[PDB]
Amino acid sequence: HPLKQYWWRPSI
């Protein structure tokens, strides 16, 4: 899973 975009609220 993407780990460079740095998500916040939208976390799956």
Side-chain angles (χ1 to χ4, degrees):
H1 300 300
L3 59 61
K4 180 180 180 180
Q5 180 180 300
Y6 300 0
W7 60 60
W8 181 182
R9 300 300 180 180
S11 300
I12 300 300

